[PDB]
Amino acid sequence: MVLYFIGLGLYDERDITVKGLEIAKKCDYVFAEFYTSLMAGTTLGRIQKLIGKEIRVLSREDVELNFENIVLPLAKENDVAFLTPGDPLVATTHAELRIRAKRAGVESYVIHAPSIYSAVGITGMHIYKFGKSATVAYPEGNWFPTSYYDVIKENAERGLHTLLFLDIKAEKRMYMTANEAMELLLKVEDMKKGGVFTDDTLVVVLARAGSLNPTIRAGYVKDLIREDFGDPPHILIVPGKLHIVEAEYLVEIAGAPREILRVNV
Amino acid sequence: MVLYFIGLGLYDERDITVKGLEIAKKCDYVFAEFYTSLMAGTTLGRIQKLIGKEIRVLSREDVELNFENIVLPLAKENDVAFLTPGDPLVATTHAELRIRAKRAGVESYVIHAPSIYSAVGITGMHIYKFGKSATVAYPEGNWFPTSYYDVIKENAERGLHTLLFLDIKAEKRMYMTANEAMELLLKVEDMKKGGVFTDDTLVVVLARAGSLNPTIRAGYVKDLIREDFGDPPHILIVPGKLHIVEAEYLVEIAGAPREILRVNV
Numbered sequence: 284m285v286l287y288f289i290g291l292g293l294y295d296e297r298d299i300t301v302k303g304l305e306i307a308k309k310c311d312y313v314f315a316e317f318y319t320s321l322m323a324g325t326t327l328g329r330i331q332k333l334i335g336k337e338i339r340v341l342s343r344e345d346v347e348l349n350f351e352n353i354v355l356p357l358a359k360e361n362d363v364a365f366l367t368p369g370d371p372l373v374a375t376t377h378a379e380l381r382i383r384a385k386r387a388g389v390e391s392y393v394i395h396a397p398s399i400y401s402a403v404g405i406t407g408m409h410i411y412k413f414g415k416s417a418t419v420a421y422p423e424g425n426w427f428p429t430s431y432y433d434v435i436k437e438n439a440e441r442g443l444h445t446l447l448f449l450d451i452k453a454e455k456r457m458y459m460t461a462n463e464a465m466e467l468l469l470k471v472e473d474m475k476k477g478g479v480f481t482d483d484t485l486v487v488v489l490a491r492a493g494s495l496n497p498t499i500r501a502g503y504v505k506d507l508i509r510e511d512f513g514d515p516p517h518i519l520i521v522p523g524k525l526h527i528v529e530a531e532y533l534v535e536i537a538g539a540p541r542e543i544l545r546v547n548v
Numbered sequence: 549m550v551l552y553f554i555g556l557g558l559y560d561e562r563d564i565t566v567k568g569l570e571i572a573k574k575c576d577y578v579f580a581e582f583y584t585s586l587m588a589g590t591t592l593g594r595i596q597k598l599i600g601k602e603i604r605v606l607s608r609e610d611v612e613l614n615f616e617n618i619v620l621p622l623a624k625e626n627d628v629a630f631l632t633p634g635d636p637l638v639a640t641t642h643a644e645l646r647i648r649a650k651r652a653g654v655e656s657y658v659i660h661a662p663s664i665y666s667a668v669g670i671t672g673m674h675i676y677k678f679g680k681s682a683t684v685a686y687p688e689g690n691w692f693p694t695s696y697y698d699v700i701k702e703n704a705e706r707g708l709h710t711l712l713f714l715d716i717k718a719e720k721r722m723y724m725t726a727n728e729a730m731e732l733l734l735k736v737e738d739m740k741k742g743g744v745f746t747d748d749t750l751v752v753v754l755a756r757a758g759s760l761n762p763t764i765r766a767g768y769v770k771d772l773i774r775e776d777f778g779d780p781p782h783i784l785i786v787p788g789k790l791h792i793v794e795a796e797y798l799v800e801i802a803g804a805p806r807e808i809l810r811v812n813v
């Protein structure tokens with residue numbers, strides 16, 4: 284009679300919370316989805332071994348089209364778990380699944396876990412100063428979306444930081460690197476000429492958040508555009524005007540050039 | 549030989565990540581602070597039992613003034629952990645403590661935990677639509693803080709949602725309720741008269757996120773300002789322009805007035 288949305292965390296199988304793990308172990312059936320994102324630091328097998336239950340993976344169609352036919356039926360006479368990378372419901376479409384549960388007469392509970400949305404706090408930048416977020420999507424064919432560029436402009440104009448989620452082709456396990464994102468942004472700038480993203484723009488790259496050894500680098504596009512930030516996933520941030528304390532952290536912890544203390548503060 | 553920043557999570561001792569627990573259990577010394585937030589579902593004893601170590605609790609003064617004299621010295625010859633509610637680097641100044649660690653020759657690592665900043669996803673509102681965040685602080689003496697009012701105004705003008713962290717006076721066991729936050733906002737409104745926060749403003753309240761049964765309520769200030777949302781902690785949200793799906797969730801899950809379904813595109 285109960286459905287549990289359980290978050291898996293940032294990177295590997297140990298990023299789930301103790302609460303999530305224990306609940307998952309007591310569920311009769313355990314489902315999971317890896318289309319909204321991937322758990323780059325582990326494998327389905329390792330997650331299964333930790334939970335001690337076989338995990339049935341669901342595709343985007345399985346969920347968006349048949350959630351009420353695949354998952355909910357079992358939740359009627361059993362405790363069912365639905366695992367998702369990060370924190371449940373941080374992905375825009377999963378909240379509606381709670382409504383589906385309701386109309387099916389199934390109780391649902393959410394077990395939270397760390398999300399890159401909150402993990403960016405490790406960049407040393409004040410979380411309250413992050414504005415609207417955006418996703419840098421790979422262009423394709425005659426389609427060249429650029430709304431993420433406008434988001435940076437609007438945030439920066441108000442002295443706010445911009446968190447940029449990078450595109451991912453989960454099915455094919457293809458990660459967009461911060462380098463590719465920087466190249467795309469420069470391309471958009473050349474098209475729009477808004478003076479929003481250039482070689483002189485200060486950016487911050489956070490790679491493999493959740494890991495004990497994430498890569499945290501800060502600096503100007505001209506210097507970081509071809510730098511190796513390690514394996515995915517990568518997150519890109521365009522800070523607004525920095526608080527001195529934010530800048531000091533980027534310099535001392537993220538290897539930012541001393542120049543940011545007088546140019547970006 | 550190292551210092552660990554480990555989050556404890558939203559509500560109880562099981563909100564710590566498996567990663568955080570396994571590491572905490574192997575540290576030689578464990579410190580913690582419980583003034584940045586409130587974990588309403590646990591106690592020091594239960595946390596100690598789970599980790600199997602004695603925990604020395606530090607006050608805001610111990611940390612901000614003497615972190616390098618109380619914690620860092622031991623981290624030079626031992627494995628030390630510093631525990632905090634939620635995520636250690638979200639809506640705190642703990643990030644700066646990493647700078648102190650570096651300058652003291654101590655390597656530090658961060659272990660994330662669920663944060664209220666991302667947990668708001670359970671309100672059904674799109675995470676990317678949250679703009680700048682703010683804190684509603686208790687007036688003191690002749691001092692009446694009001695900056696949070698301007699944050700709401702700036703976000704709303706952009707159609708963005710506003711997350712409002714509520715004040716806390718740990719040593720006095722005072723946890724600002726959503727009701728008190730609403731009362732303060734109405735007073736600021738009377739002064740600035742910007743039409744930002746009135747009895748007709750739609751707001752969302754999330755209390756005790758992390759628990760299995762958090763209170764999630766949406767409605768007009770006039771109706772919710774005297775409603776009982778249960779024990780603290782609470783956070784207040786002022787939605788911007790709602791998506792249909794956002795409104796649908798608030799109605800179905802948060803008991804919001806069905807009239808908000810009719811969006812004024």
Ligand SMILES: Nc1ncnc2c1ncn2[C@@H]1O[C@H](CSCC[C@H](N)C(=O)O)[C@@H](O)[C@H]1O
Nearest residue numbers: 585634635638663664714756757781782783
């Ligand atoms: N479980 C919870 N439910 C509702 N609000 C919460 C909460 N935990 C924290 N808050 C809110 O955030 C304030 C503390 S701010 C510190 C937040 C913490 N680093 C984190 O990552 O969550 C509280 O006063 C309250 O307004």
